[PDB]
């Protein structure tokens, strides 16, 4: 191989980030442009999301792999904050290289950013450190999900999605725990729905429906049979399927499968559960016997999902048929197969209200994109909203804070005799590309755009107003309501600057080539 | 075998089933038409304007 160091890999570092960041900065925010990206599979994927662009790319260098993975943290953490943490991380390389080109040792410049990254997250802290609860936040949450839902250019009427994200996150991620929890959110949805059709179903909705319409379409409260028992082919880990080759071999195959399921559907109904949800669900033959014994019950369920009806419903667990008892049953508030107005999206709700241990957002859309549109819309809303539900901390974004952060540090730079003022400068100097690149996606002069806000930030001494993130002509982060969790505003910084630092401490590269992913 | 070559074999075979005769004769006036088009398109005349001229012919 070759050890590639000095400007050699320093290029291989500064090289990869630029191709990466730019499609992201051209896709940056709502003004960010929607990029069709087609696989080697020949499949169009339109990506205005840097993370989705990151999900779409893997660019060859180890950092370009990690940058895809970098946003995923804040994408998991904060939701929104995916694109900005990367696009600026490459701008530091621009900054830093010139700074090394200024002769400033790489570890010197490497350190000053993080060194100046304090005020970066620290100046943010001063904007809104506020905290509110669910019914309070729901207005800031929809106000933030004005931006976050609209970050996918779908917020319209979707305060429905915001408001169901309000009560979704607090349920799963408590304001007091201050621990990230999306796990008990049950992501659910189906193609063919609407953006305007979206639901938060506090219980679990199973795809399967009643085995017959002749059997009632309502199972009463509770009394659900949670079981692993075969009513169709069992499908274990490994067994080979042999069929019947004879006339005398065919007849008895029908009798036995009738004889056991009756007793089983009996015993289940005799166990006293009026919905049998079986980890191995019903064949079409078990359905009529279920109708013979006249019990409402569910067909094939995913293996762990029968646990998902054990956890979410508060029903104490019976693993299998052999153990059937009336004490441990599945619970449901109300069992209904529900059509939302698009029968293309049709679910049987196992309804949870009193004990709901998995909250279920149900998202809808006409196409695979449109759900995913609403999905990544609300999910990134969901996380910022989660961030805001724990502590409702916002800032006036889109570079209005980046300028105001660029004041202190670049100022504070020269306050210090230390070499890192140049870094601190270039630190505070690297901040402002976001409104710049935004104004470019916003289709305006990016250069005055930043300074328009600093002219404000002179006057303002605070982000409130800003430039146009929505291209709607009102220059605001305030009445335009560019409002996002100040947490995730600080998450981009620490992730961007400290990753680049770790990228910067390594100019030492053993690869067969220069940039190897 | 060529986009304009395949219509030729057709053109020949049709006059047979059309008549039983003139099998060559439909093609002998084919290149006759194929020339005049040029001078027109060389005159620059529009081909669809040239097209209905064939009808008029």
């Amino acid at each position: 191989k070759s050890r590639l160091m000095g400007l050699e890999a320093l290029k291989s570092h500064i090289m990869a980030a630029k191709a990466v960041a730019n499609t992201m900065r051209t896709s940056l925010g709502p003004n960010g442009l929607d990029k069709m990206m087609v696989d080697k599979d020949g499949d169009v994927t339109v990506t205005n999301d840097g993370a989705t662009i990151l999900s779409m790319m893997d660019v060859d260098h180890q950092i370009a792999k990690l940058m895809v993975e970098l946003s995923k943290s804040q994408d998991d953490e904060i939701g929104d904050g995916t694109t900005g943490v990367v696009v600026l991380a490459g701008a530091l390389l621009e900054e830093a290289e010139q700074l090394l080109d200024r002769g400033i040792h790489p570890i010197r410049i490497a350190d000053g950013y993080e060194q100046a990254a304090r005020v970066a997250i620290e100046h943010l802290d001063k904007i809104s450190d506020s905290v509110l609860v669910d019914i309070k936040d729901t207005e800031p949450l929809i106000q933030t999900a004005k931006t976050t839902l609209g970050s996918k250019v779908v917020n319209s009427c979707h305060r429905q999605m915001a408001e169901i994200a309000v009560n979704a996150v607090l349920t799963v991620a408590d304001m007091e725990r201050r621990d990230v929890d999306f796990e008990l959110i049950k992501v659910e949805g189906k193609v063919g729905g609407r953006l305007e059709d979206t639901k938060l179903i506090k219980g679990v909705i199973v795809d399967k429906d009643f085995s017959h319409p002749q059997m009632p379409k309502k199972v009463e409260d509770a009394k659900i049979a949670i079981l692993t028992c075969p009513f169709e082919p069992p499908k274990p880990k490994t067994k080979h399927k042999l069929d019947v080759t004879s006339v005398e071999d065919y007849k008895a195959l029908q009798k036995y499968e009738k004889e056991k399921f009756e007793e089983m559907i009996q015993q289940i109904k005799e166990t006293g559960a009026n919905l049998a949800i079986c980890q191995w669900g019903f064949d079409d033959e078990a359905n009529h016997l279920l109708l013979q014994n006249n019990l409402p019950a569910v067909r094939w369920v995913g293996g762990p999902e029968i646990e998902l009806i054990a956890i979410a419903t508060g029903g104490r667990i019976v693993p299998r048929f052999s153990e059937l008892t009336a004490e441990k049953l599945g619970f449901a508030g109300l069992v209904q197969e529900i059509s939302f107005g698009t029968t293309k999206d049709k679910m049987l709700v196992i309804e949870q209200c009193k004990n709901s241990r998995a909250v279920t957002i149900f998202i809808r859309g006409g196409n695979k994109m449109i759900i995913e549109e609403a999905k990544r819309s609300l999910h990134d809303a969901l996380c910022v909203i989660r961030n805001l539900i724990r502590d409702n901390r916002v800032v006036y974004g889109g570079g209005a804070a980046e300028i105001s952060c660029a004041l202190a540090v670049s100022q504070e730079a020269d306050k210090c005799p230390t070499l890192e003022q140049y870094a601190m400068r270039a630190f505070a100097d690297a901040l402002e590309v976001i409104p710049m690149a935004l104004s470019e996606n916003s289709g305006m002069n990016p250069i005055q755009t930043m300074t328009e806000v600093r002219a404000r930030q002179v006057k303002e001494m605070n982000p409130a107003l800003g430039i146009d993130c929505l291209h709607k002509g009102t220059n605001d982060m305030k009445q335009q309501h560019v409002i996002e969790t100040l947490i995730g505003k600080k998450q981009q910084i620490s992730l961007a600057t400290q990753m680049v630092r770790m990228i910067l401490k390594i100019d030492d590269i053993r690869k067969p080539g220069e940039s190897e992913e | 075998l060529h986009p304009a070559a395949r219509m030729l074999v057709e053109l020949s075979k049709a006059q047979d089933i059309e008549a039983g005769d003139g099998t060559t004769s439909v093609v002998i006036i084919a290149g006759s038409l194929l020339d005049s088009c040029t001078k027109l398109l060389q005159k620059g005349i529009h081909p669809t304007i040239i097209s209905e001229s064939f009808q008029k012919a």
């Binding site: 191989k1 160091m5 990690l66 970098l70 040792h105 570890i107 010197r108 350190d111 993080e114 621990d179 990230v180 692993t228 075969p230 082919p233 069992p234 274990p236 880990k237 490994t238 067994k239 080979h240 399927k241 042999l242 069929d243 019947v244 071999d249 008895a252 195959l253 036995y256 499968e257 980890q279 293996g303 762990p304 646990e307 054990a310 956890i311 104490r316 667990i317 019976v318 693993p319 299998r320 048929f321 052999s322 153990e323 441990k328 241990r357 620490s494 992730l495 400290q498 990753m499 630092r501 770790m502 990228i503 401490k505 390594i506 030492d508 590269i509 053993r510 690869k511 190897e516 992913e517 | -």
Partner: protein, 514 residues
């Protein structure tokens, strides 16, 4: 066929290829020093500041290239620390003797005279060596701390060290009496308070698999009888893979209620042979986890064997490839089992264990890529804190001693020679390059700094040295910038000889000639 090549062309081909591999180690090992990225083979990537780690992953063709491989390991097998330094030094001599070999002049005495100062240095090293044991208290936890403070910031963390060093203190003493480096395992998370690590003697557990309700499954035990298990518990248990089938007539419903039996049997084989927390090194099935849920006995799956081992050494217990638990020592137990989430992941803490010299650290880094080196700073401190324990005499760090040793040889550079000052001038200078590498790889002036030390080394100063965050002149011993004297001693042994060895060889046979 078979190859062999003598000659200065090859003997310089020796030294040339020799200095090629030191390229890696000749960057790194410093706080403002560098780490190394070696991405080798199939696209496998590795980030290690340690040379002896990456160097052996890197291609070394030559006998000299392979000779320096153990030289880094030689220091790596000693302190686990300082591989890059011992490797950097060897190639330096070759630059210094490079005139002589291009002069063409090498009496074998030159390398034989390298051994002289090598002793004399490691002499003066262990001579000037000062024990830190009776110097610092009795418990020596300030021995630990001031070695913990300065060895946390010699790579990354100069802030947390105020908070962490005192934990690097008590973790060393607790773990020590057992030299296992697994029991200090640090737990990274995020979402709690970042840059805050708590030292917890009990082992947090990364992974456990518990479903069919999480609140109908007990997550805590004040006497876990710990099932330390290598056993997998499968989704559905077939009777046979052959001479059995599925549905063609009778086995449709016959296999299944029989399929449940082995799981009824085997999942219970953990229980009746005893357990409360069931730690399986391998997964737990969902209806199996429903079983364990229905059994109200905590079940874990995909558990790292190391977490089992730290517990194994904490319980006096053992891991079990058998669902059968036949004894408390082949099984395990503790007086506390607590599932809790610090950072948002399920931990299973075994605390108050029958032994538990394990020191677990619940740590949170400032960000994603920044979180790791803190733990590496923690252990590196823990290492040389324990190494300040495993060697009583601990001298000044940051290459403080070498400069004097250079002048100590610049003495002989004056004093010794009929000739060999040429060596003594060459040899000694290569010392100063290793801390020079720091001022270098930190971008500060070694010569200036080192010679600013030398003016006071002219005063007779010895421990005068570099604080390697600022790269500034100081007294490293008083600054508690430290490594033990044997660590200093161990370095000059190999690096001197590697030059000597590879010099004795102008000829490398290749028997396969392949």
């Amino acid at each position: 066929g078979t190859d062999s090549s003598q000659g200065i062309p090859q003997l310089v081909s020796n030294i040339s290829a020799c200095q090629v591999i030191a390229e890696a180690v000749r960057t790194t090992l410093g706080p403002r020093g560098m780490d190394k990225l070696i991405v080798d083979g199939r696209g496998k990537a590795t980030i290690s500041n340690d040379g002896a780690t990456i160097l052996k992953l890197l291609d070394v063709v030559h006998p000299a290239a392979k000779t320096l491989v153990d030289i880094a390991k030689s220091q790596d097998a000693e302190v686990g620390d300082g591989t890059t330094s011992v490797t950097l030094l060897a190639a330096e001599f070759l630059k210094q003797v490079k005139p002589y070999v291009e002069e063409g002049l090498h009496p074998q005495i030159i390398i034989r005279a390298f051994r002289t100062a090598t002793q004399l240095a490691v002499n003066k090293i262990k001579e000037i060596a000062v024990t830190v044991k009776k110097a610092d208290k009795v418990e020596q936890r300030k021995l630990l701390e001031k070695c913990a403070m300065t060895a946390l910031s010699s790579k990354l963390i100069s802030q947390q060290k105020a908070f962490f060093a005192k934990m690097v203190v008590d973790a060393v003493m607790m773990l020590d009496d057992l030299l296992q480096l697994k029991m200090i395992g640090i737990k990274k998370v995020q979402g709690g308070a970042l840059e805050d690590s708590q030292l917890v003697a009990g082992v947090a557990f990364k992974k456990t698999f518990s479903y069919a309700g999480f609140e109908m499954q007990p997550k805590k035990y004040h006497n876990p009888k710990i099932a330390l298990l290598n056993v997998e518990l499968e989704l559905k248990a077939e009777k046979d893979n052959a001479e059995i089938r599925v549905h063609t007539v009778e086995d449709y419903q016959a296999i299944v209620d029989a399929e449940w039996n082995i799981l009824y049997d085997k999942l219970e084989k953990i229980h009746h042979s005893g357990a409360k927390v069931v730690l399986s090194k391998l997964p737990i099935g969902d209806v199996a986890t429903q079983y364990f849920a229905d059994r109200d006995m905590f079940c874990a799956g995909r558990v790292p064997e190391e977490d089992l081992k730290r517990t194994m050494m904490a319980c006096g217990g053992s891991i079990q490839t058998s669902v059968n638990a036949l004894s408390a020592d082949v099984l395990g137990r503790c007086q506390v089992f607590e599932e809790t989430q610090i950072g948002g992941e399920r931990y299973n803490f075994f605390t108050g264990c029958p032994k538990a010299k394990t020191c677990t650290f619940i740590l949170r880094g400032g960000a994603e890529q920044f979180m790791e080196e803190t733990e590496r700073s923690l252990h590196d401190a823990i290492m040389i804190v324990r190494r300040a324990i495993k060697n009583d005499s601990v001298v000044a760090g940051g290459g403080a001693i070498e400069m004097e040793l250079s002048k100590y040889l610049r003495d002989y550079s004056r004093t010794i020679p009929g000739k060999q000052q040429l060596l003594i001038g060459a040899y000694a200078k290569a010392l100063e390059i290793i801390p020079r590498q720091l001022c270098d790889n930190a971008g500060f002036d070694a010569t200036n700094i080192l010679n600013k030390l030398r003016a006071r080394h002219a005063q007779g100063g010895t421990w005068y040295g570099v604080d390697i965050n600022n790269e500034d002149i100081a007294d490293n011993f008083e600054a508690f910038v430290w490594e033990p004297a044997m660590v200093r001693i161990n370095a000059l042994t190999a690096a001197s000889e590697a030059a000597c060895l590879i010099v004795s060889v102008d000829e490398t046979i290749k028997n396969p000639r392949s």
